[PDB]
Amino acid sequence: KEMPQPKTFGELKNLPLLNTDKPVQALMKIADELGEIFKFEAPGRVTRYLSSQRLIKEACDESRFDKNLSQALKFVRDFAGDGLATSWTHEKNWKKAHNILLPSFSQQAMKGYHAMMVDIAVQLVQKWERLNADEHIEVPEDMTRLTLDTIGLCGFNYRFNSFYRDQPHPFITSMVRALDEAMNKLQRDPAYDENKRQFQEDIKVMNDLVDKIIADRKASGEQSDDLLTHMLNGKDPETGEPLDDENIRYQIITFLIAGHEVTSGLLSFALYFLVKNPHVLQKAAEEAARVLVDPVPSYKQVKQLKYVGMVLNEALRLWPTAPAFSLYAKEDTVLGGEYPLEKGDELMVLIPQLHRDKTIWGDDVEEFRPERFENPSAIPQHAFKPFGNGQRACIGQQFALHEATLVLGMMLKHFDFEDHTNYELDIKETLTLKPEGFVVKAKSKKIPL
């Protein structure tokens, strides 16, 4: 009945607990101490962190709870606008953009993005093929180069050309800095004035490039296999309306901000777990060699990479790279038969803890075992939620998993990997999670592309 709560700091309540560079991992440790639910208070804010499948399955009842904009998402909305990820469900532009964009994110739609995904993936493989002996790979750095360029190409047929650069394209630099400012604002006024000025400058950089490309495309009339073409031509069946140019810009910004980092983090975590578990690596590499028999992988071949998909799902279980999502009670309701909630009360779903609920997964929750996902029928409802919940779940789920399966498959086909530093897992936190400083050596298998 009475809800646990971590230590307080006088008038600041629990807020200083987030004044750390690893806040999700701090919240996980608190959940370990306090259990399936704890209250978290800040000045002008009350929320409750959920960690058990028992309670999270109720929170995922869409008749009782709707998506809430966390403070992180509210600050991201200052540059992602009413794009899909930072809109309320009841805003006209959410359902409109949802209806228009859903068919362009389906599994069947991945057939049309596949060639562009292969384009960037081959660039990644060629980079690693061209490394000199005993040079090494900066894994999250290269994975982020790949995912940003892939979303850039598939999103609006624009080449960031990240593999030609040490300093990223100015759009990416502003994007990363804007995300950092949004997340840094959480932990916090006269000293912050330069941050505010830079933030507005970074917003302008992103808007100017995306607005320019949209305008360029409308003037040219060119049709491509990208999401921008789909949005310029699509109409919502419900309203009969297309997306306007401002919302199209916010969607493109959203694809980049919401999709690039979770996906590069997943690839980096997956390669981390592979090099730490050589038996799993061998099994995954066998499949990649058996399935990817052509110099360029086909769409159908990627779907056959079953064990690679199991590797990726188990990596998402241990370290879901979007670590939380927020909900609010649509009306007064009782959670778990003992926690009465009032209309509008907020909940946070702490995904890494859900994925460690021993009542669902057994005692070996900390072990990396892709075989847990060998038969997807064994996974209970709402025990595994790396892509969120319900109608507000990740629209890019099929995109992310096709991208990651293709790239991981090509990596395992073309290289043997060495954990030459015996890397100690160090998880950097931004809006997302990724393994900082993860480096490997790759010895080519000398298979042509």
What is d(CA 359, CA 52) in angstroms, rounded to the nearest whole number?
8
- The answer to whether 31 and 38 are in contact (CB under 8 A) is yes
Helices (H) and strands (E) in the chain, counts: 16, 12
If one asks whether residue 240 binds a copy of itself (CB under 8 A), the answer comes out as no
If one asks whether residue 259 binds ligand HEM (CB under 6 A), the answer comes out as yes
User: Which residues are within 8 A (CB) of 46 and not within 5 positions of it... i.e. 6 or more apart?
Assistant: 39, 40, 345, 346
If one asks whether residue 233 binds a copy of itself (CB under 8 A), the answer comes out as no
Q: Which of residues 97-126 bind a copy of itself (CB under 8 A)?
A: 98, 102-103, 106-108
Query: Residue 34: what residue type?
Result: L
Residue 244 touches which of ligand HEM, a copy of itself, none (Cβ within 5-8 Å per kind): none
Q: Which of 132, 220, 381, 422 binds a copy of itself (CB under 8 A)?
A: 381
What is d(CA 289, CA 66) in angstroms, rounded to the nearest whole number?
44
Closest CA to 392 of 70, 52, 53, 111: 70
Stretch that binds a copy of itself, among 24-32, 180-188, 204-212, 372-380 (CB under 8 A): 372-380
User: Which residues are within 8 A (CB) of 274 and not within 5 positions of it... i.e. 6 or more apart?
Assistant: 280, 281, 284, 311, 412, 417
If one asks whether residue 325 binds ligand HEM (CB under 6 A), the answer comes out as yes
If one asks whether residue 329 binds ligand HEM (CB under 6 A), the answer comes out as no
Question: In angstroms, what is the minimal distance from the CB of 280 to ligand HEM?
Answer: 19
Cβ distance to a copy of itself smaller for residue 229 or 391 = 391
If one asks whether residue 234 binds ligand HEM (CB under 6 A), the answer comes out as no
Distances from the Cα of 373 to the Cα of 40, 369, 370, angstroms: 33, 8, 6
Q: Which of residues 295-324 bind a copy of itself (CB under 8 A)?
A: 303-304, 306-307
What is d(CA 134, CA 284) in angstroms, rounded to the nearest whole number?
24
If one asks whether residue 187 binds a copy of itself (CB under 8 A), the answer comes out as no
Q: Which residue of the chain is nearest ligand HEM when measured via CB?
A: 396
Residue whose entry in the numeric block shows the structure tokens 């921008």: 228
If one asks whether residue 85 binds ligand HEM (CB under 6 A), the answer comes out as yes
Query: Residue 441: what residue type?
Result: K
Binding mask 143-182 for ligand HEM (x = CB under 6 A): --------x-------------------------------
Q: Which of 190, 378, 424, 446 binds a copy of itself (CB under 8 A)?
A: 378
Residue 380 touches which of a copy of itself, ligand HEM, none (Cβ within 5-8 Å per kind): a copy of itself
What is d(CA 75, CA 184) in angstroms, rounded to the nearest whole number?
10
Q: Which of residues 121-180 bind a copy of itself (CB under 8 A)?
A: none
What is d(CA 120, CA 112) in angstroms, rounded to the nearest whole number?
15
Cβ atoms within 10 Å, residue 91 = 12
The secondary element (H helix, E strand) that includes residue 127 is: helix 110-129
Cβ distance to ligand HEM smaller for residue 151 or 210 = 151
* Binding residues vs a copy of itself (CB under 8 A): 61, 63, 98, 102-103, 106-108, 277, 279-280, 283, 286-287, 303-304, 306-307, 359-360, 362-363, 369-371, 375-378, 380-381, 390-391, 393, 398
